[PDB]
Design a protein around this ligand. Structure first.
Ligand SMILES: [Ca+2]
Length: 223
């Protein structure tokens, strides 16, 4: 997250870190045994880390649970990033408490202008690299479709939305992918892609979760 703030320990209780020897992507806990992340984060050897603040220090609220199954969206296209969503099942149920909690799936899609909270452990610099130990946060509005398409000609599908600031300076970044965009207490987005980070006229692009609620629910119901 570039241009954000330190969230505060365990203030984003649905945020998970996906670990394969190190943090490589975010995710969101959606029930005691399932995480939703970005398909482009798929790999083998995933340990889900819940209850994290500093990802390099055991601070006492963590739960580390291996994945038993990962399910990339049936229509994910890695070249366009269309349908950039996956589900990860935990080998055992997380213990839910105030610091480790699921996030609601949306009942309806969100509108341009709505404020969201975007969070992650990704790079905090738009030129160069500095990766934080503690969770970072950014409040950002959803941008209109039309301005998203104008920023990224030929690249925005109906499964994507932009959020952030056309002036630049505030955005998600590498290492934030897969993490949450929460608006009005609902998971409306997944950190997906952008051109650089925090550049003028290049806001972040997010997977539009409301389009996937049916698939998420029926996948969970049979897996
Ligand atoms: Ca920790």
């Amino acid at each position: 997250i570039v241009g954000g703030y330190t969230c505060g320990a365990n203030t984003v209780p649905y945020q998970v870190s996906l670990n394969s020897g190190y943090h490589f992507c975010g995710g969101s806990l959606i029930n005691s045994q399932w995480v939703v992340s970005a398909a482009h984060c798929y790999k083998s050897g995933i340990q889900v880390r819940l209850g994290e603040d500093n990802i390099n220090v055991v601070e006492g609220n963590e739960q580390f649970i291996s994945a038993s199954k990962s399910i990339v969206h049936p229509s994910y296209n890695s070249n366009t990033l269309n349908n950039d969503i996956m589900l990860i099942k935990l080998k055992s149920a997380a213990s839910l408490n105030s610091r480790v909690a699921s996030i609601s799936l949306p009942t309806s899609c969100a509108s341009a202008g709505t404020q969201c909270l975007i969070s992650g452990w990704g790079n905090t610099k738009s030129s160069g690299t500095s990766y934080p130990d503690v969770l970072k946060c950014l409040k950002a509005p959803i941008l209109s479709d039309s301005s998203c398409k104008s920023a990224y000609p030929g690249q925005i599908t109906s499964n994507m939305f932009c959020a952030g600031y056309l002036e630049g300076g505030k955005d998600s970044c590498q290492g934030d992918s897969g993490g949450p965009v929460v608006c009005s207490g609902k998971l409306q987005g997944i950190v997906s892609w952008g051109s650089g980070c925090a550049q003028k006229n290049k806001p972040g692009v997010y997977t539009k979760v409301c389009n996937y609620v049916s698939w998420i629910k029926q996948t969970i119901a049979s897996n």
